[PDB]
């Protein structure tokens, strides 16, 4: 069987890869990470192997998994906006160097790597639908520090591509849209997967803050369930006929758009209606704030190299995300 090394396991991605992985009887997982705690159902799954370690800290240990395995999925990075102008530096020396290093390790050991590249590297592109082979990428002048992780991850994807080029590494970079679902990551996390934006108004409506519209709001978003979007990477692993091969492919749901504010309205009414609701504080109100206007995937890339169409839809996947949440929510 297969071996997939997971590296940042601990998470959103990694448990639902490695619940879809371990379903199939021709895989073995090795997932690595500084803790467990969001994969324990796990640890006693004959096909699972859990692998203490951290991509800043260990160098070797990496490696060693990289040459033992087949698939690498590099998971570890810094993606919530704030720290990108808060700790820039920490967050171009972990997502950009760290990173670098374990594709080196998969060139030098000629491993698959399926590389996490992200939807900001379109930035401020004008297409209605971001293209992952036509599209321009728009970012703004140097002196708008915000832009430092889209290059950052913009770069990486360019490098990947030069050792596809020049040096056969075999790879697939996907761009997640949005993904969510049970089990999100932690606001703060630097592993990469659900949509940050959706889990800050749940934590909102959870804690009894308000859910802050900068600038009315208005940008729009696309949303995609997990159950869509890890059936995609699932089969990105599947490589059937080999058809993913040096491609690069948008992950999202282009049906499930949506502004800030009216995802916060979707999510107020689906929390109202529901019946944990009295165990948390009253709506404190959209408040709105002023310190990329669409963000549209093109999925042709999806529909070709993997046949994939995403079949729920945008009620379901709200209702669904924040009913876990909320039944999974310590109120002590």
């Keep these: 069987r297969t071996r997939v090394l997971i590296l940042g396991v601990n998470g959103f991605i990694g448990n639902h890869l490695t619940e879809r992985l371990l379903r199939e009887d021709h895989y073995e997982v090795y997932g690595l990470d500084i803790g467990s705690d969001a994969i324990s159902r796990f640890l006693n799954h004959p096909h699972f192997h859990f692998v203490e370690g951290d991509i800043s800290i260990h160098s070797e240990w990496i490696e060693y998994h990289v040459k033992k395995c087949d698939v690498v999925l590099p998971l570890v990075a810094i ?18 160097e760290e990173n670098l290093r374990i594709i080196r390790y998969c060139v030098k050991y000629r491993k698959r790597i399926i590389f996490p590249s992200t939807s900001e590297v ?3 592109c004008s297409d209605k639908y971001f293209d992952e082979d036509h599209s321009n990428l728009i970012v ?5 520090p915000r832009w430092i992780y889209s290059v950052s991850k913009q770069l990486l994807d ?12 075999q790879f697939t970079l996907f761009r997640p849209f949005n993904w969510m679902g049970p089990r999100l990551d932690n606001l703060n996390a630097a592993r990469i997967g659900s949509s940050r934006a959706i889990t800050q108004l749940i934590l909102n409506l959870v804690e009894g803050s308000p859910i802050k519209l900068i600038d009315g709001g208005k940008q729009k978003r696309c949303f995609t369930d997990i159950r869509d979007g890890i059936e995609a990477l699932y089969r990105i692993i599947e490589n059937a006929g080999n058809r993913c091969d040096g491609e690069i492919i948008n992950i999202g749901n282009p049906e499930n758009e949506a502004s800030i504010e009216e995802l916060g309205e979707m999510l107020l ?11 948390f504080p009253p709506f404190a109100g959209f408040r709105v704030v002023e310190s990329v206007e669409h963000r549209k995937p093109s999925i042709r890339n999806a529909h070709r190299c993997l046949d994939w169409e995403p079949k729920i839809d945008m009620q379901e996947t709200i209702d669904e995300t924040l009913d876990f949440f909320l039944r999974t929510v310590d109120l002590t």
């Design 158 to 169: 360019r490098v990947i591509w030069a050792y596809g080029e020049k040096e056969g590494l």
């Design 122 to 124: 379109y930035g401020m």
């Design 269 to 279: 009414a689906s929390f109202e209606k529901h019946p944990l609701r009295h165990h």
């Design 140 to 144: 703004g002048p140097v002196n708008k």
């Design 79 to 96: 993606a919530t906006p704030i720290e990108y102008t808060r700790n820039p530096l920490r967050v171009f020396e972990l997502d950009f």
